Structure 1
């Protein structure tokens, strides 16, 4: 099994190892800390055997909606990053991480929608998001450094 808690400063070292193990977008350490500091209530880690094996890093933004047809300002949550170590996958960890963060985005930060980008070939992540009722909003052409497209995916909270 596993447990969930809010991320702390001393988790950063492990969050970074997980990020570099699982994703090509390898942010600097200060990028993680700023999100921990500013939006920490929605920033969660998954713990197995006393170690972090998964994380979700949020940002709460103010600006134009990804959902509403006409240009309108909203508080929107942004899943900047989420990852789970390979050996602990398919156990419901990312689902739980996402759910906890979405709840905090709504209850702590009063966000009314949540969004993210994901590589079009990332079927496990896309499946994960769609299972949580995210919808593909549009294709972002050449979004990634290597030129791969992303799906912008979003939903109300």
Structure 2
């Protein structure tokens, strides 16, 4: 089984290692640090045997809604990055990380809606998000480097 706690500065080495093994968007270390500094309460790691096997990196934003029809300014949570090491997948880790991060986005940071972007080919993640009541809002054409479309997904 696994446990969740808030990420700490000394987790970043392991967070970056997971990021680089699992995802092509390889953000600089300082990028991870900025999110930990500003939105840390909603930045979680999953722990198995005193090591990090998963994380969720959040951002809290203010701007136009991705959900309302008429332009509408809101406080919104943004899932920037989420990953689980291969060996530890399908154990409910990402679900747990997401539920924990979303709680904090709303309760610590006053987020009113939550959104993310995902590769249209990333069926495991799309399935995860739809389980947690995210809906496809629109296709961001050619969002990824090389040209892959993203779904913008958002949750009221």
Q: State the TM bucket, normalised to the shorter chain.
A: over 0.9
Q: Report the secondary structure of 1:109's partner residue.
A: coil
Over aligned residues, Cα RMSD in angstroms?
0.3
How far 1:146 moved relative to its partner?
Answer: 1.1
How far 1:12 moved relative to its partner?
Answer: 0.1
Q: Deviations over 1:58-114 (max 9, x none)?
A: 000000000000001000000000000000000000000000000000100010000
CA distance in 2, matches of 1:131, 1:72: 26
Q: Flag as ranges the 4+ runs of structure 1 deviating above 2 A.
A: none
Q: Which runs of 5+ in 2 are unaligned?
A: none
CA distance in 2, matches of 1:16, 1:26: 8
In structure 2, the partner of 1:83 is 83
CA distance in 2, matches of 1:155, 1:9: 29
Residues paired across the two proteins, number: 156
CA distance in 1, matches of 2:63, 2:149: 23
Using structure 1 for the length normalisation, give the TM-score: 0.99
